[PDB]
Structure 1
């Protein structure tokens, strides 16, 4: 059987992070987590490109530019959506997720999903460096794995 997998050592890997500003008090913890994950797995901070955008809505178009860079191995999308009173959350969460996934397939490059989609503020806090971990760290670890996988698969 031929088996392909990615290790979790990040030496030499180069990452793009796109991070929105809405709910920044939480997003900033996700960004801290993603960078820490990369660095302590052996990636160099210098090899990270961070792009800031206003909201989750704007993440895909920026991620599309980063993922097109030949010197970026994977893109990590970071944001925090918390349901409000209206269905706005639904439409943004749907389009952010669809856009990122579509871009990944179009560009044949891993784009990982570190966007919290929470019904409540409590759920978002839980996932931004408290009881349920740090979604930024999770999405970064995924990106490390996928970038290494792609070194043999792509």
Structure 2
């Protein structure tokens, strides 16, 4: 409920609904047009990409994601799960799910080593950079569920 898996799922549902309204027909006007996202999950298609490093922690995060979607009227048939060896492959794996026209949002869940002993962690910066660029290029929401040790 309070785990980072829950939080990532909530952002996905809101964002998916928001993009539905914007592409719809505009209103008559006469007032400021306020746009906002709903928390209803009916009729949506979702995809989750997760890793295996420290599978103890990652396992419970994925459980949270599935619970949140179904509890908000999400049908189990509309979840596609993909597993990758490690964090380095999350962005490339998320590329193929996003391009599919069936999916509406992608949730990325993972975990990264504490590190902090070197000046910079080069490997840990490409996962964040890669996902952000993919969202703008493909015009689809991608959520960052990565925990840090």
- 1:89, distance to aligned residue in structure 2 (A): 7.9
1:62 aligns with 2:93: yes
Residue 95 of structure 1 is matched in structure 2 by 126
Q: Name the CA distance, whole Å, in 2 between partners of 1:8 and 1:15.
A: 14
**Aligned equivalents of 2:135 and 2:39: distance in 1?**
20
Question: So what's the TM-score if we normalise by structure 2?
Answer: 0.74
User: Does the aligned pair in 2 maintain the 1:83–1:89 contact within 8 Å?
Assistant: no
Q: CA offset at residue 88 of structure 1?
A: 9.8
1:117 aligns with 2:148: yes
What's the offset of the Cα at 1:23?
1.0
The CA distance in 1 between the partners of 2:47 and 2:113, in whole Å, is 24
Larger relative strand fraction: 1
Of the candidates 7, 10, 13, which is equivalent to residue 44 of structure 2? 13
Runs of 4+ in 1 over 3 A off after TM superposition: 84-89
Relative contact order higher in (CA < 8 Å, ≥ 6 apart)? 1
Any stretches of 5+ residues in structure 1 without a counterpart? Answer: 119-154
Provide the alpha-carbon RMSD of the alignment: 1.7
Tell me by how many angstroms 1:70 deviates: 0.3
Correspondence 1:4-153 to 2 at 5 A = 4-84=35-115, 87=118, 90-118=121-149
Kindly state the Cα deviation for residue 111 of structure 1 after the two structures are TM-superposed.
Answer: 0.3
When Rg is computed on C-alpha atoms for both structures, the one with the higher figure is 2
On the 8 A contact 1:77/1:115 being kept in 2, the answer is yes
Q: Is the 8 A contact 2:115 2:121 kept in 1?
A: no
